[PDB]
């Protein structure tokens, strides 16, 4: 039972630059039966490579495959805008079971963008239901790696926040994140100042956005 480990985690290169994807097998893939699939978000996987070197019919020339034994590579010469998706490598030499890789997402490379940080107290409409949800928004940042920490009276909050991130924006190719702090209202009236601290590459120093219950 081969495991198909894809070495690149997130391939981050600008359009047209050379994309190199490494796919390693635990054991030798017999007769080099390796295939490459590209799944665009919300679509079915497409056939791109079989025989580890032969291109599927109708697939753009820039897609290439090579390798042998336990090492196979997917090469995209000119990174077309459509070539930003997830890629899987599949084995069918030592089957069954035909095992798949864990996949790598190919993202787009732009300049560092600082996140616009906003903080939203829970509304009085929510302040009737018995729960308080404070929202912290980071808008239009890159890279995605960003630490969001919540302070209630400057005390670090653990295990009370949930984070959500969007995919790449179609216009400015940035990411957007929210942290939702959910506590019972008693906690919200047990403390005064609510601070959101953001740690990002584009910030020379973390910015804290805060408010008081008033």
């Amino acid at each position: 039972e081969i495991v198909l480990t894809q070495s690149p985690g997130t391939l981050s290169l600008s359009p047209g630059e050379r994309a190199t994807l490494s796919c390693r097998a635990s054991q030798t893939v017999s007769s080099n039966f390796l295939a490459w699939y590209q799944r665009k978000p919300g679509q079915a996987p497409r056939l791109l490579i079989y025989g580890a070197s032969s291109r599927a019919t109708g697939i753009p020339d820039r897609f290439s495959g090579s390798g042998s034994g336990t090492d196979f590579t997917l090469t995209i010469s000119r990174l077309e805008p459509e070539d930003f998706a997830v890629y899987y490598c599949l084995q069918y030499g030592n089957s069954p079971p035909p095992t798949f890789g864990q996949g790598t997402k190919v993202e787009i490379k732009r300049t560092v963008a600082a996140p616009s940080v906003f903080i939203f107290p829970p509304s009085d409409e929510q302040l009737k239901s018995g729960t308080a949800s404070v929202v912290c928004l980071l808008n239009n940042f890159y890279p995605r790696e960003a630490k969001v920490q919540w302070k209630v009276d400057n005390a670090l909050q653990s295990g009370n926040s949930q984070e959500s991130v969007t995919e790449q924006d179609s216009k400015d190719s940035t990411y957007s994140l929210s942290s939702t702090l959910t506590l019972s209202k008693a906690d919200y009236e047990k403390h005064k100042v609510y601070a959101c601290e953001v740690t990002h590459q584009g910030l020379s120093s973390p910015v804290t956005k805060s408010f008081n219950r008033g």
């Binding site: 039966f33 295939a35 699939y37 679509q43 079915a44 996987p45 497409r46 056939l47 079989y50 899987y88 599949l90 069918y92 089957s95 069954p96 079971p97 035909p98 095992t99 798949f100 890789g101 864990q102 996949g103 616009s116 906003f118 939203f120 107290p121 829970p122 509304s123 409409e125 929510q126 239901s129 949800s133 929202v135 928004l137 808008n139 949930q162 984070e163 959500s164 991130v165 969007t166 957007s176 994140l177 929210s178 939702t180 959910t182 008033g214």
Partner: protein, 217 residues
């Protein structure tokens, strides 16, 4: 051309049995095995099994042997993958695929079909509670405690598309989904514009038009 289709997006409670169909066209149905691949949101592509539309034989992978049953008919020309006794983590998309080789064999997957999202949760259908996030200045709508996915959030009946961020839904411990839709606007517009979020939850047929007015006091 070759096509493979299924009526997906089948939210099912655990303990029940989801039966995904797969209608294929463009090739000889009896000549090639139909294979099933599942994608869990956290995990990766996992081969589940295969069936011969010529014989009816089934070859399953471990972790799916005896809990999954594939059947087919040649008349309607369809293959059915059936999962019985669903549990929480089986929430996944189930693709259908026609393999390139012929007969008792294995090859690359020649063709694929659209996925089949199956959400498995005991939570019942529930409309969302929409709360304002009052206010470049940002403001938004928090939709909380709804089930199942999806809720579609527009701003101003779709009139505001620049700077809108509808984040992917998050699953809370109660089993109810939550989502936040935010938008950034110039401060000049705080006074002369009312901001409406239209949140629609089709499974509960809930339409809420919430006004995020600038903070008073």
């Amino acid at each position: 051309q070759v096509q493979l289709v299924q009526s997906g997006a089948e939210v099912k409670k655990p303990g029940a049995s989801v039966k995904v169909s797969c209608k294929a066209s463009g090739y000889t149905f009896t000549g090639y095995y139909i294979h099933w691949v599942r994608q869990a949101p956290g995990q990766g592509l996992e081969w589940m099994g295969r069936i011969n539309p010529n014989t009816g034989g089934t070859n399953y992978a471990q972790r799916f042997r005896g809990r999954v049953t594939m059947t087919r008919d040649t008349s309607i020309s369809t293959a059915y993958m059936e999962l019985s006794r669903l549990r929480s983590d089986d929430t996944a998309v189930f693709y259908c695929a026609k393999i390139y080789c012929r007969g008792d064999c294995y090859s690359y997957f020649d063709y694929w079909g659209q996925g089949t999202l199956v959400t498995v949760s005991s939570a019942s259908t529930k409309g969302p509670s929409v709360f304002p996030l009052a206010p470049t200045a940002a403001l938004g709508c928090l939709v909380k405690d709804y089930f199942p996915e999806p809720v579609t959030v527009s701003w101003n009946s779709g009139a505001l598309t620049s700077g809108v961020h509808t984040f992917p839904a998050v699953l809370q411990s109660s089993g109810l989904y939550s989502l936040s839709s935010v938008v950034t606007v110039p401060s000049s517009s705080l006074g002369t514009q009312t901001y409406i979020c239209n949140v629609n939850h089709k499974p509960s047929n809930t339409k809420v038009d919430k006004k995020v007015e600038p903070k008073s006091c």
